[PDB]
Design an enzyme around this catalytic site. Sequence first.
Site, PDB file in Angstrom:
ATOM      1  N   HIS A  62      10.927 -77.214  13.745  1.00 40.40           N
ATOM      2  CA  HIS A  62      10.058 -76.591  12.754  1.00 40.40           C
ATOM      3  C   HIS A  62       8.896 -77.495  12.357  1.00 40.40           C
ATOM      4  O   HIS A  62       7.913 -77.031  11.824  1.00 40.40           O
ATOM      5  CB  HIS A  62      10.818 -76.120  11.514  1.00 40.40           C
ATOM      6  CG  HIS A  62      11.422 -77.221  10.707  1.00 40.40           C
ATOM      7  ND1 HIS A  62      12.715 -77.654  10.891  1.00 40.40           N
ATOM      8  CD2 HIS A  62      10.921 -77.960   9.693  1.00 40.40           C
ATOM      9  CE1 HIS A  62      12.981 -78.619  10.034  1.00 40.40           C
ATOM     10  NE2 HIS A  62      11.905 -78.829   9.300  1.00 40.40           N
ATOM     11  N   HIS A  92       7.085 -85.957   7.014  1.00 36.73           N
ATOM     12  CA  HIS A  92       6.758 -84.872   7.923  1.00 36.73           C
ATOM     13  C   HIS A  92       5.590 -84.140   7.318  1.00 36.73           C
ATOM     14  O   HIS A  92       5.194 -84.437   6.187  1.00 36.73           O
ATOM     15  CB  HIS A  92       7.926 -83.897   8.067  1.00 36.73           C
ATOM     16  CG  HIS A  92       8.365 -83.301   6.768  1.00 36.73           C
ATOM     17  ND1 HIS A  92       9.422 -83.801   6.043  1.00 36.73           N
ATOM     18  CD2 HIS A  92       7.879 -82.258   6.054  1.00 36.73           C
ATOM     19  CE1 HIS A  92       9.573 -83.093   4.939  1.00 36.73           C
ATOM     20  NE2 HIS A  92       8.647 -82.151   4.921  1.00 36.73           N
ATOM     21  N   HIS A  94       3.390 -80.145   6.945  1.00 37.98           N
ATOM     22  CA  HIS A  94       3.292 -78.693   7.076  1.00 37.98           C
ATOM     23  C   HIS A  94       1.825 -78.375   7.365  1.00 37.98           C
ATOM     24  O   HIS A  94       0.941 -78.950   6.736  1.00 37.98           O
ATOM     25  CB  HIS A  94       3.718 -78.007   5.777  1.00 37.98           C
ATOM     26  CG  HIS A  94       5.092 -78.382   5.322  1.00 37.98           C
ATOM     27  ND1 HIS A  94       6.199 -77.611   5.593  1.00 37.98           N
ATOM     28  CD2 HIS A  94       5.536 -79.453   4.623  1.00 37.98           C
ATOM     29  CE1 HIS A  94       7.274 -78.187   5.073  1.00 37.98           C
ATOM     30  NE2 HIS A  94       6.895 -79.299   4.471  1.00 37.98           N
ATOM     31  N   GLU A 104       1.782 -76.239   1.390  1.00 39.35           N
ATOM     32  CA  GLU A 104       2.846 -75.528   0.700  1.00 39.35           C
ATOM     33  C   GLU A 104       2.491 -75.377  -0.777  1.00 39.35           C
ATOM     34  O   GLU A 104       2.388 -74.258  -1.293  1.00 39.35           O
ATOM     35  CB  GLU A 104       4.164 -76.280   0.915  1.00 39.35           C
ATOM     36  CG  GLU A 104       4.599 -76.212   2.375  1.00 39.35           C
ATOM     37  CD  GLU A 104       6.077 -76.407   2.562  1.00 39.35           C
ATOM     38  OE1 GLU A 104       6.616 -77.385   2.007  1.00 39.35           O
ATOM     39  OE2 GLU A 104       6.694 -75.579   3.267  1.00 39.35           O
ATOM     40  N   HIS A 117       4.671 -84.731   3.362  1.00 36.68           N
ATOM     41  CA  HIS A 117       5.803 -84.992   2.479  1.00 36.68           C
ATOM     42  C   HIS A 117       6.488 -86.286   2.877  1.00 36.68           C
ATOM     43  O   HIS A 117       6.975 -86.427   4.004  1.00 36.68           O
ATOM     44  CB  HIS A 117       6.792 -83.824   2.510  1.00 36.68           C
ATOM     45  CG  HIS A 117       6.238 -82.576   1.899  1.00 36.68           C
ATOM     46  ND1 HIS A 117       6.772 -81.322   2.127  1.00 36.68           N
ATOM     47  CD2 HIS A 117       5.203 -82.396   1.047  1.00 36.68           C
ATOM     48  CE1 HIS A 117       6.071 -80.423   1.458  1.00 36.68           C
ATOM     49  NE2 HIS A 117       5.119 -81.049   0.789  1.00 36.68           N
ATOM     50  N   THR A 196      11.866 -77.527   0.703  1.00 45.21           N
ATOM     51  CA  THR A 196      11.112 -76.319   1.062  1.00 45.21           C
ATOM     52  C   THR A 196      11.507 -75.752   2.423  1.00 45.21           C
ATOM     53  O   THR A 196      10.923 -74.773   2.883  1.00 45.21           O
ATOM     54  CB  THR A 196       9.598 -76.554   1.043  1.00 45.21           C
ATOM     55  OG1 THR A 196       9.242 -77.469   2.082  1.00 45.21           O
ATOM     56  CG2 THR A 196       9.127 -77.073  -0.325  1.00 45.21           C
TER      57      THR A 196
HETATM   58 ZN   LIG Z   1       8.101 -80.671   3.620  1.00 44.76          ZN
END
Ligand SMILES: [Zn+2]
Length: 258
Positions: A62, A92, A94, A104, A117, A196
């Site tokens: 992901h 990581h 997003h 996010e 994050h 999340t």
């Molecule tokens: Zn994250």
Amino acid sequence: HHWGFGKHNGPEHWHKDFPIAKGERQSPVDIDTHTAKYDPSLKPLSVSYDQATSLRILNNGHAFQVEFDDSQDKAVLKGGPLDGTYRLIQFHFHWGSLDGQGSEHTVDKKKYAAELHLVHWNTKYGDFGKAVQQPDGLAVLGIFLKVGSAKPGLQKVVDVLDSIKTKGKSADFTNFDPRGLLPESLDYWTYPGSLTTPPLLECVTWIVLKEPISVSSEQVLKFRKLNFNGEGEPEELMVDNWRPAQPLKNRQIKASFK
Ligand SMILES: [Zn+2]
């Protein structure tokens, strides 16, 4: 048929396997800058990354995650809203399929191109696995990315992505200094929230930096060349791996700055 970011298993579906998805302290959230209260008790955030030891980078299906040796007090977050010491375990990102989306958290409904994050666990719980079962188990430092000038400190990450294109691929990733991913100011908003991605546990003190870092279009484009799928499976580009804003419910976001 596990959770993901496709049309049939994305964030709107997650509650079926993880009912806490509709919980009382879910993340991310929209940060309403005019409603966030300046808190004169909030201490400066202490980020001590000088001795951080990265080990490995992994495509987990992901996102990609850069993992750190967290068996000693080496890379710690403390101060700010936090009691005690939190140890860095991984970071990581997003990101979106387009520069106009990908973060996010949002700021007055504004979406950034991506969000970093840096995940830390409370040392009083001994390890990550135990920490995520506690309301104050994690502190996640969130940093927005906008597209503009390149971030030199990110380039070593971007250059290794070709070697971990597909789900399950990992690569040695030592001597990476996460200080090169931090903006100039440590002004932040903070609120209690959750992981999340599933299991969406409500164990996170969120610390979201007000100042974004700038990354280049070429840098974020390389994020978008990653694959959600494993090797030998139909290609699906790893894009839009962000969970949308969740209801704030009974929570106040506090600001470290006025
Ligand atoms: Zn994250």
